[model samples]
Target: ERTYLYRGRILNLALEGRYEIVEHKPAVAVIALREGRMLFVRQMRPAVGLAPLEIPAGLIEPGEDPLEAARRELAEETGLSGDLTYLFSYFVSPGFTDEKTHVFLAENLKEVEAEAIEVVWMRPEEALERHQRGEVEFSATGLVGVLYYHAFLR
Candidate 1:
């Protein structure tokens, strides 16, 4: 049997035999590159109790394409837009959450006005170093996108 535990912006359900799950909106992450540096944002994530460094990302609204969502999120979070190349898509957490994230590489960036985000830039190596040292806290998708770019794309 399944029980609806909560149904707000996101849904939560209890499945048979003590299993539980969360249904989340699909999201996107952008590895925006400019002048050999990557764009990042430092923002408060109340769920983790710290303002961690993250790539520009957001949920895909209903009827929206993932690429459009990626571009929209990049502009919204970093005040930047660019030529977007889709990298890949993966689940944020297959075991508990049905949230998939599309990763993209953004180039030739142009700036616009954005709010509620502190924009930062770092060299690819420095970003990876910080991530490895745990000096920067990133969502799973963010970390994976960075590593994937450096490991294969760069």
Candidate 2:
């Protein structure tokens, strides 16, 4: 880990880039489906120059449990909530990023008044076809959710 002074919007801040092999707590992902429609969000990433569909997900914050983060992210990103259960955990890119995503399955969803900036609900078949045909590009989170939903949940 090396620390250096970097320019920030307001002031120069000390930033650190740590490259190490350390144990990290896994993150949580929610598979929230309702009435054959799955709650998904469209993330507009300027870096990627495209909006990709992805399941509601976030890193488990310090001192916060995975379950709590999953619930919070699901509601924050999709304005939907449901019964969340642990499905599985996996390292997304072990060769590069050390981040681990903990997959969860959510059902019996109830919609809230809020919605993501860009959101769409689609049936499983529709999503799969779109995803495969390149009509719908799924971010890593959504891809993982789909695989787990079919390979395990189904």
Candidate 3:
């Protein structure tokens, strides 16, 4: 039987036999590029204690389309809107969590929010180099964005 150990905003903990699972909200992420720099959001992740550089992302609220969530999050975090192309989706960690993220690539961006939010704009190569040197950490979305850019966008 699937027994819930805890339930809270955005995530839930459940157990099935000897396996522990986290029932988490599926999220959306943006891979936005402009002027040779990729869009990143830096914020304190209390669980890790280090503010990792992440792509603009957020939970896909129930009843919201992944594309809509992607667009909303990108604007909320980066102050730009663009032609969004759904890239792919992935489960964060199937071993413990069912947290999936839908990723999108945005092009031909335009400024929508006059008061732009705080975003770390950096080149993918530079970000990857920093990660290689242990200077900064990259969240899943951040790492994926960097790799995807190298493979296709470049």
lDDT of 2: 0.72
Q: Which structure is stronger by TM-score: 1 or 3?
A: 3
TM-scores for the candidates: 0.88, 0.76, 0.96
Best of the candidates, TM-score? 3
Best by lDDT: 3
When summed lDDT is taken over every stretch of 10 residues in candidate 1, the lowest stretch is 10-19
Q: lDDT of candidate 1?
A: 0.79
lDDT (10s digit) by residue, model 2, range 29-138: 78876676766778677868888888787778777888889988887777777888887788876653456888788887777745335777876667788988989888
Q: Compared with the true structure, what per-residue lDDT tens digits does model 3 show for residues 15-94?
A: 99999999999999999889999998898888999889899999988789999999999888878899999999999999
Go through the candidates in order and give each one's C-alpha lDDT: 0.79, 0.72, 0.92
In candidate 3, the residue pairs with backbone N, CA or C atoms under 3 Å apart (3 or more residues apart, or in different chains) clash, namely none
Give the higher-TM-score candidate: 1 or 2: 1
Model 3, position 145, has a per-residue lDDT of 96
